[PDB]
């Protein structure tokens, strides 16, 4: 699914977030991405999504070279990916229901199907009672769970999590990790960027460590 | 057809959310539109016209800029929602349609209120605009709003790109 | 005296950050003010009673509306920075000064540009004097000041317990 | 300093975030605030700062009843407190230096004093080489540390930190805790809401647990 070949990324200003990152993740595989602050983890996750473009190397997604994707096929790439952001990127002017249902509206689903799937996704993260509220009327952990539910509603092929357990206690973090494992049991690829060792020490997964934009 | 109704409700939900900002926006358009209409009708009912032919173009130029400015600043306050939908994987047209309709109804509402103002002025102190003239004014204002909304939304669109 | 410079610098930074948006904001106010200028010029040189009084108020009613609306939306775009500065512990007067100076400048540039446009029309085909120019500039600045005050005050009553 | 007497908080709609919370903190004391997601921690911290108003009970800050403060005295209360937010509440259109220096400018300090103090504060959180950058050009952990530096630059009387360790790894979390302890060594009161059981396990401080708006 995911391949990096000598991937480098330099922003406008000379601050190199990455330097020669190369790895490979087979379909349905799960892994952890770790590092210090400023390491370059979110830059890697964004380079996967096509939000940013690498300064060098090649990125392959599902066997298709997305190094130089045109602006017209980017949404078709981003539709197969369920992305959880670090600032949660919500729509503050729409309800929780509309926020979670917008991927299905973009997809073109039916009303009954949308209702059923949004109810199920909200029930997974324990936010079924909070479907009519606006994101202002929620907590930080609740808003993060709204973003998670929005991510896991359209049955993606690849999951990209950008520290999805911050603002969540140990019980909720373990529950969210169990939800991601449940999704991975059916062939979904997961890449979870985080820096809490307590959660990742009790499960043996592939390890990706980032230090000043270098992969080990 | 299915997505048209979703976009139409999206435009009204924004306009209803901030009624004072919308009403103040429309009230500017009605005032800027009611002057050319009185000037046209007083000339129609009644060589100096060639000396005002270069000034008649001045009043009509204001309405192009007022509506264009009005829609531009509305989309700017919502430039965050454009970024969010692009991240999810929405196409360019999907994002565009809510904004095109909101600009069109903004210009249409101003032109409709403009006609009401012109009629009141006539009743104070001659015949007013005809039905065809009212329809033409409404259509032109709607097209102006549509074009302005398209321009502003496209300008903000080529900002959240990987480049 | 120490905070006037900091308030003034912030006012220019907001306007200079988006030159395309600010200039178009300036450009509409210039167009709206040109109409009273030429109409007053013609009436001054030539010279019904109740056939221009309702017209005269119509253009002057526009400049209040065009200036007020332009300041209304510019402050609405930056209403997040009002909340952040209010959380730290800034007073109402501290927050109000940068917005007041932006309102007065916005009208001043628009009135100055309309003076140039009216001068072009006279050259293209006797006009306003220096006193009238100063009066128009002062009136537009006063309107911009009041518009900025109203918008920022209404935004301050929103971010309250 | 901080005193709660039978405080209650109910939001608009009937959601009670707190119920009968009462406790007291002596000057210079350091403590932790914990709970599940949605427990009511940020509501408590906001009630201390005067951002929210209690629905019942009384709140005392430095011996002055602030349960019914007038709007003309709120800035004089909030100048004495260094608050860290969960959203980091930065000004995106100003540089890091201006963001950190704005409390000093509001206080009315001279140029050279501003230079020295802001440079020292940015050196405390390790962001001195990023004083000219904008918050968009910063990572999540760096933005959180910018908020921290803005908080600890004006020598406050009380520190209200709300999870200032999310987006920060274990080493940086330890450094931030040591910085807070360094500030508490001179008589600064610290009340820190956190989700990190490992961080609070290795040091013995007062513990305040919140469950569905109830204090233990
Ligand atoms: N918009 C930007 N422009 C330029 N440089 C940026 C930008 N955003 C981040 N950076 C820089 O790129 C590098 C990597 O940042 P990134 O956020 O990817 O790291 P990270 O390790 O995921 O951070 P964190 O652990 O705090 O979430 C850092 O030097 C960071 O300051
Ligand atoms: N603006 C708001 N309006 C109404 N209710 C709110 C608002 N913000 C939070 N709440 C509710 O108040 C309660 C407490 O939320 P709060 O964010 O204070 O808890 P918390 O324990 O700090 O959260 P977290 O652990 O997720 O950071 C919850 O029921 C929450 O949904």
Residue numbers in the entry:
A (entry chain A), D (entry chain B): 1 to 216
B (entry chain D): 334 to 379, 501 to 579, 596 to 633
C (entry chain C): 334 to 380, 502 to 579, 597 to 632
Text of the article:
FtsEE163QX was successfully expressed and purified in the presence of ATP, while the sPG hydrolysis machinery complex FtsEE163QX-EnvC with ATP was further obtained by in vitro reconstitution. The FtsEX complex structure shows a severely disordered periplasmic structure, indicating that this domain is highly flexible. Notably, the cryo-EM map of the FtsX periplasmic domain in FtsEE163QX-EnvC is significantly clearer than that of FtsEE163QX. Our results revealed that a single FtsX molecule exhibits a topological structure comprising 4 transmembrane helices (TMs) named TM1-TM4. Between TM2 and TM3, there is a helix α3 corresponding to the coupling helix. The interaction between FtsE and FtsX primarily occur through the coupling helix, a fundamental component of ABC transporters that links the NBD and TMD to drive conformational changes in the TMD and other subunits upon ATP consumption.
FtsEX, an important component of the divisome, is mainly recognized for its involvement in activating the degradation of sPG through amidases via the periplasmic factor EnvC. FtsEX belongs to the Type VII ABC superfamily, which includes LolCDE and MacB. In contrast to the reported ABC transporters, FtsEX neither transports anything across the membrane nor extracts substances from the membrane but interacts with EnvC to form the sPG hydrolysis machinery to separate the daughter cells during cell division. The activation of AmiA and AmiB by EnvC is controlled by the cell division protein complex FtsEX, which induces conformational changes in EnvC through ATP hydrolysis.
